[PDB]
Amino acid sequence: MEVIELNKCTSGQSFEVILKPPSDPSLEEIQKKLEAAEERRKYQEAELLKHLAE
Amino acid sequence: MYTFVVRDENSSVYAEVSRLLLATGQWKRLRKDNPRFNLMLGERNRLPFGRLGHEPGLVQLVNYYRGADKLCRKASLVKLIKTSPELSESCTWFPESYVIYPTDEREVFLAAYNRRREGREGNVWIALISSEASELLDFIDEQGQVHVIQKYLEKPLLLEPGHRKFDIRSWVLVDHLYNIYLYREGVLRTSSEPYNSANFQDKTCHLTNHCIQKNYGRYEEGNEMFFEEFNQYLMDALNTTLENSILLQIKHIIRSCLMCIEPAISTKHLHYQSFQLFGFDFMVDEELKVWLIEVNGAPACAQKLYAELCQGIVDVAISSVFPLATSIFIKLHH
Amino acid sequence: MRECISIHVGQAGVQIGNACWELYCLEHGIQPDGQMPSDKTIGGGDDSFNTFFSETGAGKHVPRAVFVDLEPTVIDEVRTGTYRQLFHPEQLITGKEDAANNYARGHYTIGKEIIDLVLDRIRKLADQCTGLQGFLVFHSFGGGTGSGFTSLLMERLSVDYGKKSKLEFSIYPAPQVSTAVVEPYNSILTTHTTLEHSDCAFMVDNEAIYDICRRNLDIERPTYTNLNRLISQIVSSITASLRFDGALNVDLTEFQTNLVPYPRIHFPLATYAPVISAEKAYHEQLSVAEITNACFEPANQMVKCDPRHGKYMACCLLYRGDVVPKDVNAAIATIKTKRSIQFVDWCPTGFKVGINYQPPTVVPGGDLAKVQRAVCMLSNTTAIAEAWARLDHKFDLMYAKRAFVHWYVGEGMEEGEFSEAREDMAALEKDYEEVGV
Amino acid sequence: REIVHIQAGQCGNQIGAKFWEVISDEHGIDPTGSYHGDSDLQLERINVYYNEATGNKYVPRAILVDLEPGTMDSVRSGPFGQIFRPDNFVFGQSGAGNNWAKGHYTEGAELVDSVLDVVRKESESCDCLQGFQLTHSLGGGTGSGMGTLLISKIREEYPDRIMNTFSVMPSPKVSDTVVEPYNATLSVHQLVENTDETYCIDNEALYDICFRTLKLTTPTYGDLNHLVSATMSGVTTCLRFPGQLNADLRKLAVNMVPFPRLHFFMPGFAPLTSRGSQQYRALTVPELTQQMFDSKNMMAACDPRHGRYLTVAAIFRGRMSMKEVDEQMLNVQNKNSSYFVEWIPNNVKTAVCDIPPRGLKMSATFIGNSTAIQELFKRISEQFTAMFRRKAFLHWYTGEGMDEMEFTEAESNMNDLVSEYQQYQDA
Ligand SMILES: Nc1nc2c(ncn2[C@@H]2O[C@H](COP(=O)(O)OP(=O)(O)OP(=O)(O)O)[C@@H](O)[C@H]2O)c(=O)[nH]1
Ligand SMILES: Nc1ncnc2c1ncn2[C@@H]1O[C@H](COP(=O)(O)OP(=O)(O)CP(=O)(O)O)[C@@H](O)[C@H]1O
Ligand SMILES: Nc1nc2c(ncn2[C@@H]2O[C@H](COP(=O)(O)OP(=O)(O)O)[C@@H](O)[C@H]2O)c(=O)[nH]1
Ligand SMILES: COc1ccc(C=C2c3ccccc3C(=O)c3ccccc32)cc1O
Ligand SMILES: [Ca+2]
Ligand SMILES: [Mg+2]
Ligand SMILES: [Mg+2]
């Protein structure tokens, strides 16, 4: 019903129609997560090479 | 070879359907959580409609209409009727009702309670049955959940011999094309104890539930009169038929209720598909004027009618989508 | 004028990025060699299209875009493709071996050895900006790179560009074109880690696009090319307000303002119409009322769901072609009385409308026919939560047996992150439930 | 992503030589190592298996190993014997006498370093080595013993590379010696730990197929290898040719292996054909799909109905309706959804390749990770125990330094593997 905020230009136009009214982690922590996961990989690989060494 | 699943064990109707399906030797029941199904006889609560119609290479069908609860819940049915222009506040086949929350339209209800009292006309209502507003509001707040207050039909039609109260149960099947099918066989859930106009305390002749009644089995087997007998009584006692005096109104009410919510629940262009069996409870006053009481989304059938109705469901609602290698239904055209 | 940088991660991101930028060039009349004859301000300017294209003294218009994939195969086709001259080497980044459909491998293992390079190549674009708005990130949910590396990138951008907005164009997994069995794992994992870092995300379910191509373009087996050219049209409709003169959604902040009242619930549903086959001999052009009505058909949505059984928080209509406000309002009034459109009680029941008189451009030799008027509706409805429900269910089935989990644990990820991600998703489904019912 | 091929022992070299012979024809490569094809599809992913020399000469990235020169001299004198890099011929003289201990601990330990020097020389040429593939038998001594020794030492030097194997299982129906169950049991112990993917090629299955289906009265090792070479060509199709999913062993492993130890696949193939006998009628897609799932078409003598499929990979070759493929594949799953685990959604994936194998207008290769594979290991375990309960023929092994405990341990691990498969069959 109510058309408002009609804005017109050469490219087109825009408006709003209403039918009814209403009723972060730091660089430190990130580098910590990545390196911590890298350590777990190193540990897993070391356990393998140790197992293979046996 | 089609496939289906069962997720409602307590369903007497569809326990029989799954039986019939298996007996064709062209349907295979799968486990509960097997997603690769053609048909789903889903649960009553928290049915996962969102997970339907996303299996490539499978046409999927479910035995429930999403959003049909708005019709099959007493609090919702009132709101639906009052807000929908199709039914309107002026609806003549639905009793005057109001939505009441425990400590909403309580002030609105009292405004009508006054005209009844300041008019010296019938002023009995129902949630228990009472003629005093205070006795009712004190009962709702004592229960906990939301209740609906409704005008009590003080002048119901009474079967003879017995001076008995009764209600009518009609079974309606809506398929995937939203064809509205009325089961030709209905049943009158009667009271055996004579209707008492003065004493509302005794709720044994006011409430006609099959459980409460179970004078049980005096006049007919199990307090259940079918249409052939009821039709005969109307002819002998009132010089009319079930078709003319009542069934036209019933078909009108059913048609109107389902047409109202069609755009909200229709699965015409959906990725999955729905059908559903409903149970409409009707009430007849002394002037042969039909009133809608409520709608059941998960209705049980009558023992005699299980075999015929359940088979009917397979024919028009299931086999119509999944065909295999005169009609008991009356099509309410629209 | 404020610039926008487009980031394309993984196979899906890159190949969709190619479709979009191809289309962009055709809409602005830019040639494969980057020359734009209509641009009379040689070597610079602050026009609307400069939001996406920077300029060189030689008169070349280059995309403000970076392509990144942990495998060289896909981007190599950009290096040697028809628009090879458009981008320059520093924009096209490639690794040696991919993430192997593994989130943990893309995020932790391989992500760590290339993240600094990527951010540096991004920083080089940002330095060429006078006023950076933010980023548009294209990626898949299912891919190891698209899921794993994206989330890591999104985390760092929030650190290096804290004041900048970040939008997503995300491909939701569909078995009909799925490449991995563990895509639900990757989807939940990247969604959990990216959620706090994304201001607004447009999900496209490959299932929806696949069936739209089959149903409306009569393509029996849609290829990625078929899917992507259709997606690029939708993406174009969404970003057109950033590239052309207008007053609606003129910057990235306005997307969150107009579509996302609640931060976590920042997944607007896109619905596009009309989709018509180019090899359709005889076609009757559709009207404003007809295409606007199609915006409420699930068969036209980017995600198959039922908005009737949910609640709207916001709704924008974006028209392109022969359209005027009068016909739009007439179409809305009619639709309102025929369809179920429930808004949340704390939002006005209304529509923000944007019209561009230039009709949608079609790729020569493409599958889409030229139309006189098209529309893309952006509605934030709780019904899109059905997609989260589907996805979390598949996640639960596999994780209950810890199937495939060892692949992620082997890349340095903890098994706890699975349950932590799933819990965050369980909360998300709850948020949608509170708002919607 | 380059793959380094290795073939060990008599069986390993004979199926290995046959494998290169088949795919060399598919890629247009002749015995000289020169290309003579008509499609660029043939050369797009040929780097995966072939090294390119000057003058555009294609040489297999293959290493031939044995503890005796007999079989390798036959290869070198075979049809495509000249294509192989002569330096990649690494062989001993003593043999292994069908003894796992000799191949793994004594005779093979003396030769293994020489092999790893050739592996290292090949790997250093690779732009980005993705992994290895081994062809060998488990019933002998060299392929079984030294082959698994190689795998262990390759897993010590390239621990982040994929190890794949085509392992021929022994069978009394096609037996050379009685100690095959010993050699096989000892080898399975190794494969469970040190491979990502193992294609179980059962000689019992290959025999039954040749006898029952192909109606060959007396099948030879040549007949058996016609089935193997056809299967090996199929399972490596997506690795060797352009397609939707982009050619690498890790993505196969990730999607096929829900649990690390359960990585023993059942190969299948359709249509089943015998040597020389040309078929004139191409199979319809419904026929390819039906047959490739039939137990009669499985290369591992296990009944798939006795177990459940964890994951499945299917590759159709030839000019066909990829839509019809989709429907038929979806039909199988939707018809027999009980034989697929429900806790791995969409565990069946399919790919298509335009290029068909030689002699067929179209074909279908099956790669299944079924829990029914336990039947294979139970069979070997029963044969193992029948002898081991009396310590029969054990002196062949203790004479090489082995102890009875190592047999008891190998026996225990395979029985564990069996029970692990059984755990997920009743999930
Ligand atoms: N719409 C569309 N989806 C795609 C396209 N390419 C891949 N996908 C989807 O992306 C998902 C897999 O992610 P990819 O982008 O292919 O993989 P990636 O991002 O490169 O990550 P990795 O290869 O595992 O390292 C699958 O579900 C595909 O369906 C594309 O071009 N268009
Ligand atoms: N407003 C009214 N006026 C007259 N009778 C009424 C009435 N409201 C209810 N009743 C009488 O109500 C009895 C029981 O309750 P109601 O109809 O709400 O059943 P439930 O027990 O709520 C539905 P059903 O058991 O059929 O699923 C009706 O069947 C009828 O006997
Ligand atoms: N399929 C096939 N199996 C073989 C062949 N030669 C031997 N075998 C099997 O391999 C086992 C013997 O191993 P073999 O390769 O001869 O021992 P090795 O040379 O010391 O490795 C037995 O179980 C045989 O059935 C062959 O050419 N083809
Ligand atoms: C069981 O789920 C999956 C199993 C395997 C794959 C990928 C593969 C695969 C991946 C890379 C290379 C080769 C292969 C194949 O040759 C193959 C053949 C048919 C179908 C899938 C696959 C992808 C999946 O999603
Ligand atoms: Ca300019
Ligand atoms: Mg990739
Ligand atoms: Mg031998």
**Rounded Cα gap, residues C92 and A10, in angstroms:** 36
| Residue C328, domain extent | 269-383
Q: How far is CA C57 from each of CA C3, C34, C42, C88, rounded to the nearest angstrom?
A: 18, 12, 7, 15
Q: Is C11 helix (H, G, I), strand (E, B) or coil?
A: helix
Write the residue with the smallest CA distance to atom 17 of ligand 3. Answer: D140
User: Which DSSP category does B127 fall into?
Assistant: -
B203-210 long-range Cβ contacts below 8 angstroms, 24+ apart: B203/B128, B203/B129, B205/B164, B205/B165, B206/B129, B206/B165, B208/B165, B208/B166, B208/B167
> Using DSSP, how many helices (H) and how many strands (E) does chain D show?
15, 12
Q: Are D356 and D362 in contact (CB under 8 A)?
A: yes
Same domain? For C165 and C275 the reply is: no
**Rounded Cα gap, residues B11 and A54, in angstroms:** 63
- Interface test mutation site (partner D, options B27, B36, B37, B54, max chain D beta carbons within 10 A): B36
CATH code for B64-95+155-334? Answer: 3.30.470.20
- For chain D, the maximum distance between any two Cα atoms, rounded to a whole number of angstroms, is 61
Structure-token match 């307590």, residue found: B10
H helices of D58-111, in order, are: 70-76, 100-104
**Rounded Cα gap, residues C4 and B324, in angstroms:** 58
Q: D391: Cβ–Cβ under 8 A, 6 or more apart, which residues?
A: D404
Q: Are D140 and D96 in contact (CB under 8 A)?
A: yes
**Chain C nearest-CA residue for D326:** C176
CATH code for B1-63? Answer: 3.40.50.11480
Q: Is D4 helix (H, G, I), strand (E, B) or coil?
A: strand
Q: Are B205 and B193 in contact (CB under 8 A)?
A: yes
**Strand-pair partners of B153:** none
Task: Count CA within 13 A, CB hemisphere, residue D208.
Answer: 15
Q: Is B166 helix (H, G, I), strand (E, B) or coil?
A: strand
Smallest CA-to-CA distance from B55 within D334, C256, A16, C275 is with D334
Question: Which H helix or E strand runs over C381?
Answer: strand C373-381
Q: Are D225 and D10 in contact (CB under 8 A)?
A: no
Asked which of C243, C268, C293 is the last residue of a domain, the reply is C268
Same domain? For C184 and C134 the reply is: yes
- Nearest 5°: the CA angle B217, B219, B224 is 65
On whether any CB of chain C is under 8 Å from the CB of D330, the answer is: no
Q: How far is CA B305 from each of CA B170, B265, D400, rounded to the nearest angstrom?
A: 12, 28, 82
Smallest CA-to-CA distance from B66 within B299, B261, B321 is with B261
Q: Are D245 and D338 in contact (CB under 8 A)?
A: no
CATH number of the domain encompassing residue C41: 3.40.50.1440
CA distance A49 to chain D (A): 7
**Rounded Cα gap, residues D203 and D224, in angstroms:** 8
**Strand-pair partners of D352:** D316
**Strand-pair partners of B168:** B188, B282
Q: Are C280 and C273 in contact (CB under 8 A)?
A: no
Q: Are D284 and D393 in contact (CB under 8 A)?
A: no
Is the sign of the CA dihedral B2, B8, B14, B20 positive or negative? positive
**Considering CB atoms only, which of B3, B31, B56 is closest to D330?**
B56
Please give the distance, rounded to the nearest whole angstrom, from the Cα atom of residue B291 to the centre of ligand 2.
11
CA distance C48 to chain D (A): 38
The neighbour count for residue D306, using CB atoms within 10 Å, is: 14
Which ranges in chain B are annotated with CATH 3.30.470.20? 64-95+155-334
**Rounded Cα gap, residues C383 and B327, in angstroms:** 39
Q: What is the DSSP string of D33-56?
A: SBB--S-GGGTTTGGGTEEEETTT
How many whole angstroms from its chain centre is CA D271? 19
Q: Are D68 and D92 in contact (CB under 8 A)?
A: yes
**Strand-pair partners of C7:** C66, C137
**Rounded Cα gap, residues C223 and C231, in angstroms:** 12
Q: Note the ligand closest to the C-alpha atom of C19.
A: 1
Rounded to 5 degrees, φ, ψ at D386 are: -55, -40
**Considering CB atoms only, which of C109, C347, C357 is closest to A22?**
C347
Resolution to 1 decimal place, in Å: 2.3
- B178 torsion bin: left (phi>0), alpha (psi -120 to 50), beta (else): left
Task: Count CA within 13 A, CB hemisphere, residue D140.
Answer: 24
**Rounded Cα gap, residues B288 and B93, in angstroms:** 12
Q: Is D399 helix (H, G, I), strand (E, B) or coil?
A: coil
Smallest CA-to-CA distance from C258 within C295, C303, C304, C312 is with C312
- Total residue count of chain C as it appears in this document: 437
Q: How far is CA D79 from each of CA B153, D82, D220, rounded to the nearest angstrom?
A: 100, 8, 19
Q: C28: Cβ–Cβ under 8 A, 6 or more apart, which residues?
A: C36, C38, C49, C53, C61, C243
C338-344 long-range Cβ contacts below 8 angstroms, 24+ apart: C338/B263, C338/C293, C339/B263, C339/C296, C339/C308, C340/B263, C340/B264, C340/C308, C341/C296, C341/C307, C341/C312, C342/C310, C342/C311, C342/C312, C343/A20, C343/A22, C343/C311, C343/C312, C343/C313, C344/C311, C344/C312, C344/C313, C344/C435
Please give the distance, rounded to the nearest whole angstrom, from the Cα atom of residue D96 to the centre of ligand 3.
12
Q: Is D214 helix (H, G, I), strand (E, B) or coil?
A: coil
Determination method here?
A: X-ray
Q: Are C286 and C293 in contact (CB under 8 A)?
A: no
Q: Are D24 and D30 in contact (CB under 8 A)?
A: yes
**Rounded Cα gap, residues C412 and A38, in angstroms:** 6
Q: Is C49 helix (H, G, I), strand (E, B) or coil?
A: helix
Q: Are C121 and C90 in contact (CB under 8 A)?
A: yes
**Chain D nearest-CA residue for A51:** D156
Please give the distance, rounded to the nearest whole angstrom, from the Cα atom of residue A10 to the centre of ligand 6.
43
Number of domains in chain C: 3
**Strand-pair partners of C92:** C67
Smallest CA-to-CA distance from D409 within D384, D374, D376, D375 is with D384
The structural domains of chain D, ordered by start, are 1-258 (3.40.50.1440), 259-372 (3.30.1330.20), 373-427 (1.10.287.600)
Q: Burial level of C338, CB count in 10 A (0-12/13-18/19+)?
A: exposed
On whether any CB of chain C is under 8 Å from the CB of D254, the answer is: yes
Chain C positions touching A38 (Cβ under 8 A) are 108, 112, 412
Q: How far is CA B160 from each of CA A10, B95, B244, C378, D164, rounded to the nearest angstrom?
A: 82, 25, 20, 64, 87
Q: Is D210 helix (H, G, I), strand (E, B) or coil?
A: helix
Smallest CA-to-CA distance from C405 within C147, C192, C103, C145 is with C103
On whether any CB of chain B is under 8 Å from the CB of C112, the answer is: no
User: Which DSSP category does C267 fall into?
Assistant: -
Asked which of C241, C268, C295 is the last residue of a domain, the reply is C268
**Rounded Cα gap, residues D278 and D89, in angstroms:** 35
The dihedral formed by the CA atoms of A32, A38, A43 and A46, expressed in degrees to the nearest 10:
-150
Same domain? For C119 and C234 the reply is: yes
Q: Is D111 helix (H, G, I), strand (E, B) or coil?
A: coil
Q: Is B172 helix (H, G, I), strand (E, B) or coil?
A: strand
Rounded to 5 degrees, φ, ψ at B290 are: -80, 140
Q: Is D137 annotated as a binding residue?
A: yes
H helices of D77-216, in order, are: 100-104, 112-123, 147-157, 180-194, 203-208
Indicate whether residue C100 lines ligand 1 (CB < 6 A).
yes
CATH number of the domain encompassing residue C368: 3.30.1330.20
Q: Are D206 and D221 in contact (CB under 8 A)?
A: no
Q: What is the DSSP string of C279-347?
A: T-SS-PPP-HHHHHHGGG-GGGBSS---GGGS-EEEEEEEEEES--HHHHHHHHHHHHHHS--PBPTTS
Q: Are D163 and D194 in contact (CB under 8 A)?
A: yes
CATH code for B96-154? Answer: 3.30.1490.20
Cα(first)–Cα(last) distance of chain C, in Å?
A: 41
Q: Note the ligand closest to the C-alpha atom of B78.
A: 2
Which ranges in chain B are annotated with CATH 3.30.1490.20? 96-154
CATH number of the domain encompassing residue C420: 1.10.287.600
Same domain? For C29 and C6 the reply is: yes
Q: How far is CA B265 from each of CA B37, B268, B322, C174, rounded to the nearest angstrom?
A: 22, 9, 22, 26
**Rounded Cα gap, residues D146 and D11, in angstroms:** 13
Tokens of B11: 């369903």
Q: Are C306 and C341 in contact (CB under 8 A)?
A: no
Asked which of C242, C268, C294 is the last residue of a domain, the reply is C268
Please give the distance, rounded to the nearest whole angstrom, from the Cα atom of residue D10 to the centre of ligand 7.
5
Q: Note the ligand closest to the C-alpha atom of C50.
A: 5
Could C349 and A17 be called an inter-chain contact, meaning their C-beta atoms sit closer than 8 Å? no
**Strand-pair partners of B172:** B182, B278
Tokens of B187: 């049943």
Same domain? For C164 and C120 the reply is: yes
- Nearest 5°: the CA angle B287, B290, B295 is 160
**Rounded Cα gap, residues C87 and C61, in angstroms:** 9
C254 is catalytic: yes
The neighbour count for residue D287, using CB atoms within 10 Å, is: 16
- For chain B, the maximum distance between any two Cα atoms, rounded to a whole number of angstroms, is 68
Per-residue three-class SS string for B5-74: EECCCCCHHHHHHHHHHHHCCCEEECCCCCCCCCEEECCCCCCCHHHCCCCCCCCCEECCCCCCHHHHCH
Question: Which H helix or E strand runs over C188?
Answer: helix C183-194
**Strand-pair partners of C203:** C170
Same domain? For C396 and C304 the reply is: no
Same domain? For C255 and C289 the reply is: no
Q: How far is CA D391 from each of CA D385, D386, D398, D403, D414, rounded to the nearest angstrom?
A: 9, 9, 11, 11, 18
Chain B positions touching D337 (Cβ under 8 A) are 3, 30, 34, 36
- Total residue count of chain B as it appears in this document: 334
Q: Which amino acid is at C425?
A: M
**Strand-pair partners of C269:** C379
Which ranges in chain B are annotated with CATH 3.40.50.11480? 1-63
